[PDB]
Amino acid sequence: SSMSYSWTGALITPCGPEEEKLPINPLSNSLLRYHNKVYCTTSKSASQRAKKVTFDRTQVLDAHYDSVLKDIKLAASKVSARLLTLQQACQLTPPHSARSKYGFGAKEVRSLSGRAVNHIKSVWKDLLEDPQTPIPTTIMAKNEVFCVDPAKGGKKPARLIVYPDLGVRVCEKMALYDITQKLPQAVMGASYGFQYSPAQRVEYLLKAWAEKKDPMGFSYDTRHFDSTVTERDIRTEESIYQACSLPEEARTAIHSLTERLYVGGPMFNSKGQTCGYRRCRASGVLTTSMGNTITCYVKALAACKAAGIVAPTMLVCGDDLIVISESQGTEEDERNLRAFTEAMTRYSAPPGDPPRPEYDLELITSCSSNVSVALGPRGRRRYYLTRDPTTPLARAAWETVRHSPINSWLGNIIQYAPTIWVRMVLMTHFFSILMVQDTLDQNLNFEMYGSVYSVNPLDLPAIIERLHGLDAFSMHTYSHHELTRVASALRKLGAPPLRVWKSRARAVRASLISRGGKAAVCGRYLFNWAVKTKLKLTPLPEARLLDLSSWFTV
Numbered sequence: 421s422s423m424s425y426s427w428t429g430a431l432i433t434p435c436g437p438e439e440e441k442l443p444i445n446p447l448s449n450s451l452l453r454y455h456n457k458v459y460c461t462t463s464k465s466a467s468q469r470a471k472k473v474t475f476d477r478t479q480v481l482d483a484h485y486d487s488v489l490k491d492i493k494l495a496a497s498k499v500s501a502r503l504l505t506l507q508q509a510c511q512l513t514p515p516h517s518a519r520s521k522y523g524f525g526a527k528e529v530r531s532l533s534g535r536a537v538n539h540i541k542s543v544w545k546d547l548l549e550d551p552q553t554p555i556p557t558t559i560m561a562k563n564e565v566f567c568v569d570p571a572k573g574g575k576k577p578a579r580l581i582v583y584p585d586l587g588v589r590v591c592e593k594m595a596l597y598d599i600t601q602k603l604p605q606a607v608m609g610a611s612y613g614f615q616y617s618p619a620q621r622v623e624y625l626l627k628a629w630a631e632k633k634d635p636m637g638f639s640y641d642t643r644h645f646d647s648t649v650t651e652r653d654i655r656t657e658e659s660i661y662q663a664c665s666l667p668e669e670a671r672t673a674i675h676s677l678t679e680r681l682y683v684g685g686p687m688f689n690s691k692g693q694t695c696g697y698r699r700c701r702a703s704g705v706l707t708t709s710m711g712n713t714i715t716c717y718v719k720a721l722a723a724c725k726a727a728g729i730v731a732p733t734m735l736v737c738g739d740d741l742i743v744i745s746e747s748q749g750t751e752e753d754e755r756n757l758r759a760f761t762e763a764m765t766r767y768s769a770p771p772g773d774p775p776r777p778e779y780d781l782e783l784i785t786s787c788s789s790n791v792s793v794a795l796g797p798r799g800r801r802r803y804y805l806t807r808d809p810t811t812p813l814a815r816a817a818w819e820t821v822r823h824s825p826i827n828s829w830l831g832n833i834i835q836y837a838p839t840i841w842v843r844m845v846l847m848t849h850f851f852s853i854l855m856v857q858d859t860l861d862q863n864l865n866f867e868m869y870g871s872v873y874s875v876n877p878l879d880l881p882a883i884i885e886r887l888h889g890l891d892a893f894s895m896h897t898y899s900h901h902e903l904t905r906v907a908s909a910l911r912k913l914g915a916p917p918l919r920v921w922k923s924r925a926r927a928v929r930a931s932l933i934s935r936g937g938k939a940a941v942c943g944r945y946l947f948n949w950a951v952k953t954k955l956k957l958t959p960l961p962e963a964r965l966l967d968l969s970s971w972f973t974v
């Protein structure tokens with residue numbers, strides 16, 4: 421049928437400056453040594469990515485898909501959603517959002533300047549009066565930091581990002597923002613992954629595991645997901661949004677955004693040259709996350725039907741998928757999972773890596789993370805979320821004239837506080853750097869799902885206890901897998917071994933305790949693991965006052 425992209429030959433040119441590594445990395449050169457292994461994806465590689473994601477797609481639906489789709493439009497029909505005011509949409513523009521071709525940017529939009537409000541008024545009117553003219557988009561390479569992997573060909577080529585002008589992005593929010601806050605939950609309920617904190621996500625997976633008589637799990641991820649989304653998929657989501665109770669002015673605009681933007685259109689490089697035509701999902705529109713998650717859920721749940729997965733329990737995060745179900749014996753389980761992949765490939769969601777039944781919760785990795793188990797001092801099993809620390813460490817060492825890694829450090833401390841690598845490596849280096857800079861009580865930003873939250877470093881014991889409980893300060897005995905991976909990745913980046921971080925942490929704890937006050941609380945709670953004779957940690961009164969509800973939602 422249809423090709424995901426077609427190209428003119430104009431290069432995918434860069435969007436501003438692409439930072440150079442510096443000869444000295446002063447904030448992270450005591451964290452790790454192999455800075456040569458830490459790289460940023462660039463627009464140089466956008467053409468290799470463009471080759472990999474360009475392919476003819478043939479999608480064959482069936483009675484299982486059709487049945488799932490009907491059940492989901494019915495669930496959608498219980499949702500009522502309102503237009504956003506143009507002013508409400510403007511105020512949701514992030515402060516550094518790409519400026520507009522029409523002489524204004526995020527600053528003027530968020531301030532409700534008249535020049536911008538006027539322009540966006542006319543963009544909106546044109547949305548309701550013209551249902552068909554394609555909206556131009558810009559294509560840029562994403563810049564993101566990785567560690568080199570010689571197993572996987574060296575350096576990953578840059579992901580492709582496609583977005584329309586800033587005026588249209590505000591209009592998307594008027595039409596569709598309220599649906600993004602309501603649809604995924606109403607359609608998948610507890611299966612919606614972007615509603616769980618790390619501890620809540622572990623609770624959920626453990627609950628699912630324990631109620632199967634004979635549990636079996638697998639994960640799934642689609643190869644180059646946005647390029648596999650077909651024009652029929654994108655119109656099938658217009659009809660899932662339209663299933664809601666909506667004012668007519670929204671319906672018109674949703675239809676027009678679908679036909680003129682979401683189903684495809686022309687792409688321009690940053691020099692204004694025509695770059696190609698797109699017939700798949702543009703990653704950069706407001707509906708990227710909601711479309712990906714709903715379209716993944718319909719296909720995945722359809723394929724489960726097609727393969728006879730029994731009593732499935734799903735957890736869907738974009739195109740990342742976990743299914744825990746009743747095992748039919750290992751021989752049938754392997755057959756079913758082959759059937760699942762075949763169905764998914766027929767629905768145009770072919771796999772990155774072929775899935776495989778597992779019977780141990782630690783062996784299932786999805787959303788870049790997995791469940792692991794540690795004892796305490798009691799011998800009592802405590803379960804937590806963790807991940808390969810390689811990409812976290814690489815981003816910990818990204819240091820340019822324009823980018824500080826310090827926010828990146830805080831983000832992993834909050835999100836993976838119970839892990840051994842956060843406790844022994846990141847926390848130790850974090851507080852070591854801030855004490856020497858004398859910046860312990862200076863606010864940092866925590867970035868999650870678009871939003872930024874203000875965090876004072878000295879409040880981490882309360883924050884961590886509110887998120888992960890007091891067991892995050894007491895994990896005694898980590899798993900063989902977890903010890904092996906953390907030791908491997910430190911070796912892989914030239915960081916000191918865990919024995920060295922234990923020495924450094926004894927020092928950080930001592931200095932923290934000597935400063936008294938809030939710092940000493942950090943020394944005692946965050947570093948209790950490092951002293952021979954453990955203090956008895958008591959619940960922190962501050963933690964009950966904390967509302968972290970919106971931190972891990974959307």
Ligand SMILES: Cc1cc2nc3c(=O)[nH]c(=O)nc-3n(C[C@H](O)[C@H](O)[C@H](O)COP(=O)(O)OP(=O)(O)OC[C@H]3O[C@@H](n4cnc5c(N)ncnc54)[C@H](O)[C@@H]3O)c2cc1C
Pocket residue numbers: 614708709712737738739740787788789867868869870871974
């Ligand atoms: C709705 C949503 C909006 C986000 N907006 C921003 C932003 O504005 N600025 C910023 O710096 N970071 C943004 N992020 C990245 C976010 O903070 C997390 O880093 C992200 O969820 C990656 O999870 P992971 O690295 O642990 O594992 P991953 O495997 O990398 O991510 C898990 C799944 O979440 C989806 N996803 C991952 N990263 C993104 C992303 N940037 N945008 C959209 N979907 C993604 C994918 O479908 C992926 O399969 C966003 C993430 C989501 C889910």
Ligand SMILES: Nc1ccn([C@@H]2O[C@H](COP(=O)(O)OP(=O)(O)O)[C@@H](O)[C@H]2O)c(=O)n1
Pocket residue numbers: 562579641642643644645646647701703704708712738739
């Ligand atoms: N930085 C990112 C990463 C993922 N995504 C979205 O999430 C989808 C799946 O992400 P992914 O990690 O599986 O990478 P691919 O499947 O695209 O190779 C993308 O195809 C994009 O639609 C995004 O919009 N921005």
Ligand SMILES: [Mn+2]
Pocket residue numbers: 641642643644645739772
């Ligand atoms: Mn994928």
Ligand SMILES: [Mn+2]
Pocket residue numbers: 641642738739740
């Ligand atoms: Mn993925």
